Ligand binder design. Sequence first.
Ligand SMILES: [Mg+2]
Lengths: 92, 100, 48, 105, 99, 117, 145, 144
Amino acid sequence: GVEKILSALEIPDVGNLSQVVVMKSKNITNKCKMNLQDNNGNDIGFIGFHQFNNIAKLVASNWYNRQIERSSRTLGCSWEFIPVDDGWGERP
Amino acid sequence: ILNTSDSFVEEFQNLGAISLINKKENLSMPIIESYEIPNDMLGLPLNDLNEKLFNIYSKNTAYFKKIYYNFLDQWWTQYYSQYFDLICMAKRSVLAQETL
Amino acid sequence: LQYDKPYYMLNLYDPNKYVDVNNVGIRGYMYLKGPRGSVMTTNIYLNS
Amino acid sequence: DIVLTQSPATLSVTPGDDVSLSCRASQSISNNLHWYQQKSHESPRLLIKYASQSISGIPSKFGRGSGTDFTLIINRVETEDFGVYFCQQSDSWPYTFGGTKLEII
Amino acid sequence: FLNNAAICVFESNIYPKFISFMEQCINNINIKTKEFIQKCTNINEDEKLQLINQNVFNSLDFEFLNIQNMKSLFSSETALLIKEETWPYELVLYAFKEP
Amino acid sequence: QVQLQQSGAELARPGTSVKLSCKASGYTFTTYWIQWVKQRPGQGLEWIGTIYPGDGDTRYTQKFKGKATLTADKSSSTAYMQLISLASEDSAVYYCVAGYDTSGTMGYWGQGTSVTV
Amino acid sequence: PEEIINLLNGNNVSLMRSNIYGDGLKSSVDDFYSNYKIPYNRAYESNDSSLDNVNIGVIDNIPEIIDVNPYKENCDKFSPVQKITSTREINTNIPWPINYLQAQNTNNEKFSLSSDFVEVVSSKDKSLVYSFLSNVMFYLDSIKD
Amino acid sequence: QIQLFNLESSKIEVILKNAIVYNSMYENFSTSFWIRIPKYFNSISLNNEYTIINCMENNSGWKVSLNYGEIIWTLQDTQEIKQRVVFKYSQMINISDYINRWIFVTITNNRLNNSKIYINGRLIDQKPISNLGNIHASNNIMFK
Ligand SMILES: [Mg+2]
């Protein structure tokens, strides 16, 4: 399947699995994209989600690579990183 | 519409957008609830008065937002309806000329 | 955006979902779980 | 309504001694209580406003209490400090009083 | 053109009357609040002054006009789909390396 | 400074009526509650009622409901109390007062009106 | 049509008749806005997500209802709703937008573009169609010989 | 990125040249800046307008002030005739684009037509300032 389900692995257990992430800044510049790549420089696809039964799993999909930038279909692989800030300051 | 002149564009510029429609005045002023403050707070102390005045203040702000939404709904129902009528009629005119 | 900094995640297609991990390991997966919930102080703020 | 029970009914004091006048409220009134002194043939005089606040040039030996238990301290009773002491509440509209009689031994 | 004309009508004809009604309302509210706070028994004049200044309403408390929200009203999903189906792109070649 | 002056008729027959007055000066007459206190000779204080002259807000105690009638004239800075159906129990000294920080308290005192029924 | 615009002239003869169709919804002359009191209380204090609590797995695990214990009177007599569409017939001397719109349609195989609405609606042919395509008519004129 | 606290020593002063201080009735002018306003937590911030950027001199000039979900631009002539424009953002919302986020504010002032306030490059509000007379701004701009 083109949809590769992402997983959280032990750091000493990654081995030769696909882990190299290329970051992208799209316009502030809040919109962030993450294209996954194996250790051979090939594209695994952008990191978004896909529906498997009830659960929408985090997935590297090359279908995003087939979509033009800024298209609505690219809003699934667009992410927002939120650090703890003293201006927001709710309980972590 | 505004075709009585030799140029519609300058007439629109002069007379504003409101001149495009036929029913200019349709707004009805909503009735308010007359403002009253409860009488049990006359003898309240300082600290225990302030934070309930806070609640009443937020109430008044919410009431203001509600009145604004009433005006917005009036605009959409009474005014923008005629402009969407104009949109559809102009599109039909475009289609007729294209057919010609 | 900085290295070595912890960031909670938001997905722009479904802002009301947050990233959660079902199980750790190759046999596990990570998915978007909702709702986020609401944090509030009355008459001041009520946010996700 | 609010009832102010004041104690003692009458008191005898040596000049130069500390005294306490107890004012008990049937309901909680925060600090909305006020102490007054009334001498012979004279109208009462405001001593300390609120639970504990100084007024003009009243002797600097008064003011104490909150809630339902209030006390009028007097650090050094002098000869002119004879008279009736009253406490009143300004929380509820009834606006009740009490009564105590400070005499000097 | 006609959407912008209608929004201009809201800004030029409806919003002013909303503003007039709102200041008519807030004048009454401010008068009532000031008189009530002066009626208060268990606070002094400084507290009355600061509390009146605390809970006054000015013209800024009801200036809700946001032209960008008005414009975004018509930014429906269907409009987005039409925009992306009718943009001038007739060919956009992409190429990448899958495993 | 603030001063309060009361007159009263000071002498009346049982069953008749009387109207005591209280003139205020030195402050804004319409910003302080003005209250009346009854004191029988040698007894303690007895609260009667309070008037706000800003908009004429009356509030009485239940014991002096039909006896006392409180009014105030905005233009003359005068607060009046009317005692009607006078009996022997009304012979007392009557004070009209208003506070200076807490409007409910009595800070500044009038000279009093001694009535005799 | 909800109403019909009859465009007359000075001599009061029908030059054209245009249709205006209604929405089909019921109408009320009561003017809701003028009588509505905006609530002060009880509404003082809406995410794009409503079906989150629908769990497809557990629902798919619920067995079908087999042994039905029917409730005898579970339905009403179905009453159809009928509607009589009324048509108004209103006259005017100043052309309406629908008048100008209808003037741009012709069933004639051979027609001619014109920028004169009165001439188009009063045509004695009647093969003239109202058009505001100024450049098109200009170019068609330039090559007429 | 500059952080200004509610302290007297947390301030930035700009002494302007005498040839660029505003004193006119007809000269249009604009301002722009990126501001990050933290969320309001206390009720004491309710109905508490506080200036952050100050260019007022004897009640004449311009100031940028803040309030509970309010960015306020204030113009005032020498006759104490003043006009205020506002951008309001609510704190009662699931996810906000303005609360504790960097916002690009732009205020344009046409002395003949209107004063307009834009947020993130989009027109937000406008008020007619054509009824304002002569405005004499400050010789310095105060950020505090
Ligand atoms: Mg999917």
